Design a protein around this motif. Structure first.
Motif, mmCIF file in Angstrom:
data_model
loop_
_atom_site.group_PDB
_atom_site.id
_atom_site.type_symbol
_atom_site.label_atom_id
_atom_site.label_comp_id
_atom_site.label_asym_id
_atom_site.label_seq_id
_atom_site.Cartn_x
_atom_site.Cartn_y
_atom_site.Cartn_z
ATOM 1 N N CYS A 1 -2.663 67.615 37.544
ATOM 2 C CA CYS A 1 -3.726 67.013 36.757
ATOM 3 C C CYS A 1 -4.365 68.019 35.819
ATOM 4 O O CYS A 1 -5.444 67.780 35.313
ATOM 5 C CB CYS A 1 -4.803 66.423 37.677
ATOM 6 N N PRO B 1 -3.025 66.664 43.832
ATOM 7 C CA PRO B 1 -2.798 67.305 42.529
ATOM 8 C C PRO B 1 -1.976 68.590 42.591
ATOM 9 O O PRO B 1 -1.485 69.042 41.560
ATOM 10 C CB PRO B 1 -4.215 67.619 42.045
ATOM 11 N N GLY C 1 -3.042 62.004 36.423
ATOM 12 C CA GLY C 1 -2.078 62.791 37.161
ATOM 13 C C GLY C 1 -0.646 62.535 36.761
ATOM 14 O O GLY C 1 -0.253 61.401 36.513
#
Ligand SMILES: [Mg+2]
Ligand SMILES: [Mg+2]
Lengths: 225, 225
Positions: free
Chosen positions: A126, B72, B196
């Motif tokens: 991200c 993430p 993401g």
């Protein structure tokens, strides 16, 4: 040399996306409603800027922290803590000068208008989302410096490869919310109720979460002239 | 001894608020739609739990990371990185047992149902907001373990002094969003578009930001019977 403005030297930036420019050139413009010239400078590494300035910014940030109204920190940082925080990845300094280089031993209390950092707001998958934090010299209050800092941000963040901007905590009592972020069309993509215990406020202060798409920015906002 | 369940030993928790209980007692209940008994245990420090389990969880998390759909992180953590991450502050382990203590050298691939951490989501002035991350053993998929983990969270987080809960990134493709968080009345207080880059998805996946008030929780959700 121009190593100091090479995106090639970007530390701890986006994992999946490259910079859109090979360099970040200093950006000159005028203070709003003024003929006074300012220049914004990239900082890819602390070595490319004078210690005296760094030490100034160090103190500037801790004053802002000590005020207890803007940032979540309770305590002042150590010098090393500040370096790791403000210069983890990228930063910018904006000086009241017409020069296209940073000069040493200046009177920062006059010359330093403002600064901010840019880093990934999240881990790698991200990491195209960037976070930024801003500081304005109090001696230049009332000159719309923070607005200009944001325009610089909008110009430069995408260049580093970021696609979207996140501010996780902007307190409703922070006038930057409506003076700047709302004006530049940053969306309030969320709100955290009673987010922060702040100095001078009896009750907990709500915080806004701001987002903006850095691939579809309004040229009106990008233009500094 | 009961040092292992004393809130007095809470590391890196809230700055401004104390715990509401002097201890966290293990919580027993049944798996949904089952007569199988589970027990949730507090972890204030890694020394109070068996290494074999820690090492199991270590691997469990990296598998979850390697899947590339939930967290993430791109890369697997080192053992020390995992310790600093999962056990920075508080954690919980949930075991398929009827005992009120953790026993050593168990078959975790069977006995470990799930785990999560709880820490402050922000620096001190906002540290009454907690963050949590959850993991379920894949061997116990389909048994509604994640829902129970959330109920435990709701029961225990406030006890540590937290007043509000923040999940900064919950991917829309993550079935916990609608299976659990929505069901327990966690508000979607924000959304990050294209947040993401995930394994197995051509386009970037949006992420939800969830919040909940930990002072005004529905008893229906707190009850495990
Ligand atoms: Mg060029
Ligand atoms: Mg008690």
């Amino acid at each position: 040399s121009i190593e100091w403005k090479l995106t090639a030297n970007l530390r701890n930036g986006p994992t999946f996306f490259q910079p859109l420019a090979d360099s970040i050139e200093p950006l000159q413009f005028k203070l709003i409603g003024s003929d006074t010239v300012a220049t914004a400078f990239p900082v890819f590494d602390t070595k490319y800027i004078p210690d005296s300035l760094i030490n100034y910014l160090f103190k500037l940030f801790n004053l802002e922290i000590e005020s207890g109204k803007t940032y979540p920190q309770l305590h002042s940082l150590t010098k090393q803590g500040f370096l790791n925080y403000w210069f983890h990845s990228f930063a910018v300094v904006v000086l009241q000068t017409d020069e296209k280089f940073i000069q040493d031993n200046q009177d920062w209390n006059s010359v330093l208008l403002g600064t901010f950092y840019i880093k990934p707001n999240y881990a790698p998958r991200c990491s195209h989302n960037c976070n930024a934090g801003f500081l304005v010299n109090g001696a230049h209050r009332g000159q719309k410096v923070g607005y200009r800092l944001a325009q610089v941000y909008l110009n430069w963040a995408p260049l580093l490869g970021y696609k979207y901007s996140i501010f996780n905590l902007v307190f409703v009592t922070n006038q930057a919310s409506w003076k700047i972020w709302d004006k530049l069309n940053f969306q309030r993509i969320g709100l955290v109720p009673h987010a922060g215990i702040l100095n001078g406020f009896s009750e907990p202060v709500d915080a806004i979460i701001y987002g903006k798409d850095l691939t579809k920015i309004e040229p009106e906002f990008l233009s500094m002239e």
